[PDB]
Amino acid sequence: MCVLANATFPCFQPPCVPCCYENNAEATLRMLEDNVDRPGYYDLLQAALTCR
Amino acid sequence: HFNVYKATRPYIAYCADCGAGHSCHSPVAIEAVRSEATDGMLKIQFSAQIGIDKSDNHDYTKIRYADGHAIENAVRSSLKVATSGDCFVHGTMGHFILAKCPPGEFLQVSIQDTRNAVRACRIQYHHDPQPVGREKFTIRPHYGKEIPCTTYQQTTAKTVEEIDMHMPPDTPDRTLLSQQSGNVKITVGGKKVKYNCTCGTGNVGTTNSDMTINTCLIEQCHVSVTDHKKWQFNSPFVPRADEPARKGKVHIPFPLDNITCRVPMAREPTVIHGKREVTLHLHPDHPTLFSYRTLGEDPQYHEEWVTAAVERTI
Amino acid sequence: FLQVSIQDTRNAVRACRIQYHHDPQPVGREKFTIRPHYGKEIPCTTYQQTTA
Amino acid sequence: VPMAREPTVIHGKREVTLHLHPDHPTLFSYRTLGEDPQYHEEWVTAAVERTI
Amino acid sequence: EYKTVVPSPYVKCCGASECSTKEKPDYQCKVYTGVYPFMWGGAYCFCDS
Amino acid sequence: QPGRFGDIQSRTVESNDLYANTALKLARPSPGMVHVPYTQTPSGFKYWLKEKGTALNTKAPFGCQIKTNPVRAMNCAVGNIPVSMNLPDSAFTRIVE
Ligand SMILES: *[C@@H]1O[C@H](CO)[C@@H](O[C@@H]2O[C@H](CO)[C@@H](O[C@@H]3O[C@H](CO)[C@@H](O)[C@H](O)[C@@H]3O)[C@H](O)[C@H]2NC(C)=O)[C@H](O)[C@H]1NC(C)=O
Numbered sequence: 001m002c003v004l005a006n007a008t009f010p011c012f013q014p015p016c017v018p019c020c021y022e023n024n025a026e027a028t029l030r031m032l033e034d035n036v037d038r039p040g041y042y043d044l045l046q047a048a049l050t051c052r
Numbered sequence: 053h054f055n056v057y058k059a060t061r062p063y064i065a066y067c068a069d070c071g072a073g074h075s076c077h078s079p080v081a082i083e084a085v086r087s088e089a090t091d092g093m094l095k096i097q098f099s100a101q102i103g104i105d106k107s108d109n110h111d112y113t114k115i116r117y118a119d120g121h122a123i124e125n126a127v128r129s130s131l132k133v134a135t136s137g138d139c140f141v142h143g144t145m146g147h148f149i150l151a152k153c154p155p156g157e158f159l160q161v162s163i164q165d166t167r168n169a170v171r172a173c174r175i176q177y178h179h180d181p182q183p184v185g186r187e188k189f190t191i192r193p194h195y196g197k198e199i200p201c202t203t204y205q206q207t208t209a210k211t212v213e214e215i216d217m218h219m220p221p222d223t224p225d226r227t228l229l230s231q232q233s234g235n236v237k238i239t240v241g242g243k244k245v246k247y248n249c250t251c252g253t254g255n256v257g258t259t260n261s262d263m264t265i266n267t268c269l270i271e272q273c274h275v276s277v278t279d280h281k282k283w284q285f286n287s288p289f290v291p292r293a294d295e296p297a298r299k300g301k302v303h304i305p306f307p308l309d310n311i312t313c314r315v316p317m318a319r320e321p322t323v324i325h326g327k328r329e330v331t332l333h334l335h336p337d338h339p340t341l342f343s344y345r346t347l348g349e350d351p352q353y354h355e356e357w358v359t360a361a362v363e364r365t366i
Numbered sequence: 367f368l369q370v371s372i373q374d375t376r377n378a379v380r381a382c383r384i385q386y387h388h389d390p391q392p393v394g395r396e397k398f399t400i401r402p403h404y405g406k407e408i409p410c411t412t413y414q415q416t417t418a
Numbered sequence: 419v420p421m422a423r424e425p426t427v428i429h430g431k432r433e434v435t436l437h438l439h440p441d442h443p444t445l446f447s448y449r450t451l452g453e454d455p456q457y458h459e460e461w462v463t464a465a466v467e468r469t470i
Numbered sequence: 471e472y473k474t475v476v477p478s479p480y481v482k483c484c485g486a487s488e489c490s491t492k493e494k495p496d497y498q499c500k501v502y503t504g505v506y507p508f509m510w511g512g513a514y515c516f517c518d519s
Numbered sequence: 520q521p522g523r524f525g526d527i528q529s530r531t532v533e534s535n536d537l538y539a540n541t542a543l544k545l546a547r548p549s550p551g552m553v554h555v556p557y558t559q560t561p562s563g564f565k566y567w568l569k570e571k572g573t574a575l576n577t578k579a580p581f582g583c584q585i586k587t588n589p590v591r592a593m594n595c596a597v598g599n600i601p602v603s604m605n606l607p608d609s610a611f612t613r614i615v616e
């Protein structure tokens with residue numbers, strides 16, 4: 001249910017999968033800062049910094 | 053795994069006195085201390101997260117701490133939390149520490165630097181724990197009742213708790229300007245610096261390489277490192293970046309949970325019968341609460357904190 | 367009380383004790399313990415490290 | 419040195435009820451600035467209330 | 471028991487800022503003039519006053 | 520009122536609304552530091568914990584213990600209890616026996 005400018009993608013599956021932080025740290029942090037008020041923030045965080 | 057702390061870094065704050073009565077910026081600054089546990093376990097909060105090495109890898113031996121916009125590490129040992137006496141460290145994760153301390157009027161935290169120099173910061177705090185129950189015992193006995201209480205647990209699972217994180221500001225620095233002769237050089241190495249020099253035409257903007265202004269001295273040029281890749285913290289001792297702010301969300305470890313304590317049972321008092329009267333001998337070992345009431349239509353109240361051997365008529 | 371000690375040449379402790387009732391009170395009208403980060407500036411006196 | 423909090427004032431008919439909240443021993447004193455003053459001075463330790 | 475939330479200050483310099491009202495319990499906000507802050511590496515905000 | 524019981528109140532534990540009156544007041548920062556000073560009257564709930572005074576468990580008349588969850592008073596001797604009965608014929612015994 002999260003939003004990225006004009007994306008409107010489910011918070012469970014961000015479009016930056018995989019390694020959102022490693023590929024672009026600043027973009028990932030600025031993406032997180034726009035979803036603090038969304039109820040599904042923590043699910044997005046669980047997927048934003050999770051890659052093996 | 054998940055590794056939340058990969059995008060979080062230690063920071064330098066302002067400390068009241070660093071163990072000697074002088075004020076200076078230390079990397080082991082203390083934030084608020086939480087003591088909302090019944091049994092008396094504190095949660096000190098560092099400014100330098102401990103339990104994670106410099107390379108963002110989990111480790112039980114190294115701790116992170118900031119030093120001149122450059123992250124270093126120190127051994128987990130020599131981490132000393134203290135009060136009027138000396139404390140015992142129970143848990144450890146990220147910024148937070150768990151400890152049990154004797155009563156006192158302050159507490160300090162310190163740990164060795166890279167060059168084996170102690171870095172400390174002490175805060176005024178009035179600590180005076182009281183065990184749950186009606187007796188003010190000191191240590192648990194080997195025979196007594198079981199009374200419910202609350203305490204901090206060591207698990208670091210989901211807790212539903214918050215820390216606000218925001219992007220660090222542009223740190224001032226002036227050791228980078230090297231005035232040689234009517235010109236300056238800007239030092240680099242991974243820090244994209246900002247500058248503003250009011251000599252001649254426009255000399256503002258960012259860069260990631262050495263430059264020369266060739267016009268003025270170091271009196272006007274200044275450097276502001278603009279690292280923008282890691283959340284730091286939302287602390288009152290460090291400025292913000294923008295008016296609406298950015299904000300972020302991070303869970304804390306060590307949630308609160310129910311456990312049970314053991315409490316001693318005081319000796320039975322000696323009774324002496326009389327004519328509608330009882331003389332009562334009391335032999336306490338430590339402050340106990342004594343109370344009685346008459347179970348008639350209009351009772352006759354009493355309660356007291358007996359400290360030494362006494363004699364009461366009821 | 368207070369005591370002073372330091373190790374000997376043979377790594378033996380040499381100490382001595384003297385009775386002394388130490389209980390300082392800071393200058394002002396409050397009996398605080400540690401200086402705060404926001405307050406007044408009240409004059410005092412102290413020993414300096416210079417050896418002039 | 420630190421500065422203590424302002425006490426809570428409750429007005430009355432030619433009276434003031436003061437609620438005092440100290441963090442550490444502070445000194446509280448007042449005087450009536452008439453022709454014959456009403457001297458007073460005390461060392462406050464715990465949370466109390468005073469009528470002056 | 472309550473808990474006081476105090477966000478980091480926003481030192482806007484070579485300019486000015488205006489306080490904005492919000493619907494928060496017991497909210498308090500003010501703007502100060504003439505600050506010259508210092509940090510560990512030095513003092514930023516070139517503008518003197 | 521600040522400093523006493525009920526300085527902050529909420530209609531229910533999960534309710535969003537909150538009324539807080541603790542006399543929070545800001546002060547001008549000292550020169551050459553960044554600290555955001557403030558002053559505030561201490562919490563009223565912590566004060567109430569230390570000087571609530573007595574209770575009803577050690578104060579109730581007629582010698583009856585007060586318990587909680589749910590609030591109740593147990594074994595509390597007062598008054599009379601009328602009793603109405605209706606017995607069958609199997610309980611009694613014939614006078615000849
Ligand atoms: C320690 O144990 C006590 C008692 O078991 C815990 O207090 C109880 O916590 C539960 C948590 O679910 C409360 O339940 C709540 O009840 C309300 C009633 O409407 C309901 O709307 C909620 O959805 C929830 O189910 C319960 O009220 C509360 N008090 C009791 C049982 O008297 C306490 O939380 C425990 N402490 C811990 C785990 O740290």
Ligand SMILES: *[C@@H]1O[C@H](CO)[C@@H](O[C@@H]2O[C@H](CO)[C@@H](O[C@@H]3O[C@H](CO)[C@@H](O)[C@H](O)[C@@H]3O)[C@H](O)[C@H]2NC(C)=O)[C@H](O)[C@H]1NC(C)=O
Binds near residue numbers: 250256485516
């Ligand atoms: C780089 O440093 C220079 C230092 O001179 C900054 O110049 C300053 O810019 C501010 C913003 O306009 C000026 O404030 C203005 O002051 C006039 C009154 O003189 C007032 O009427 C305006 O409303 C405004 O407040 C300030 O005067 C000026 N400094 C000087 C000495 O004139 C410049 O802004 C810095 N660059 C950046 C990107 O911040």
